[PDB]
Amino acid sequence: KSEQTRALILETAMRLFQERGYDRTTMRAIAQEAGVSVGNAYYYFAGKEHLIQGFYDRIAAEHRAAVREVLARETDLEARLAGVLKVWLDIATPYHEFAVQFFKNAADPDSPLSPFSPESEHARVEAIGIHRAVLAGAKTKVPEELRDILPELMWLSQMGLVLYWIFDRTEGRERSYRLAERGARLTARGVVLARFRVLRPLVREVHELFTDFL
Template sequence: MGFDKSAETRQLLVDTALRLFRTDGYQATTMRRIASEAGVSPGHAYYYFTGKDELVHELYLTIQHDHRERTLPCLVAGAPLATNLRVVLDCGLDVMEPYHAFGSAFVQNALPSTSTASPFSAESGDARAMAIALMGVVVERSAVRAPRNVLDQLPTVLWLVYLGVTLHWVTDSSRDHHRSRILATGVSSLVSRAVALSRVPGASGLITDATHLLTRLTPPPEERTP
């Protein structure tokens, strides 16, 4: 019973924080405000989370869960990679849409190399793994002809593409963020063509190099920021 109550309180704090992130923005949302809105004491809130940056990882996980649930029914088995990649990118933009208002402030917080909110940080590992796994499903369900080493690394590369589209979306001031949709369409076609070219001898090294660069940028668990 005690465990259920503890889990319920923790989830209440998460839900409250995400709601305030959407309505008030990241900078205006403080731990004291989260605690007050959730009806618990600040000390109680800090018992569950050391600060709002830690709640950002709950946001990452929530977005990844929603992204997966929205994407999977829309993927077309045997479709070209460009088609299914466009699906996963569009679904990602749909899921993130409620958080656009505070996107710029959030990116400023996540960009520093020491930030635990960075998508490359050790603390973001669970959400990153979920996102790459979803891209793995995209590859599996698509008609992709490429060398084995390219297919193995492709989900990680597609995740990098997703990050790039997300960064553009954060700064996109066009109506209904139309430019981000154009980018999603264009980059899906370009990536699909690049993967097709990987069958040309020597070209597969481009994807290998991109993945190795990502590996060097992502800190191992032992480098977790205190």
């Protein structure tokens, strides 16, 4: 079933370039290993970057499941965000050597692979969604002026943290997981401060700036 032999191929490719490198991995090897003509392989994915898309997509959706447990017993913002970023890290863990090799492909600004490209759109909206979940259900006061962009800013933090995590050479990535924690604490205090009357000017400013930009 197309919808089903599709996920077969995504899977054989995902494991293939993990073992080999995105670069020296051909559609043809993927087809061969998959039991599927080269032409079929291209039918489900028009070349190698569309598999990465489907991998991002796949990773986003896995992330979104493992945060059931965390969103279930954390009420306040900080603990919500922090767990979600930790859960992210936990499921990225096995893909880390791949992310380091793959980094130089995805880090090409003008490549579809870049998480900021238009191809990656479906995966951004997806991931921002989680950041919608983290606050929309956080029993912690959040000013209206901010409610509309925090998602996006939090998502940005998360890309910061991905970048940092590719290059974190500490044991088991201790430091990244620290960064998520500090990042969440810092975000959370920003919002509390945001409630302070004297600097709604400032909160307006960043509301505007954040509604304009990619």
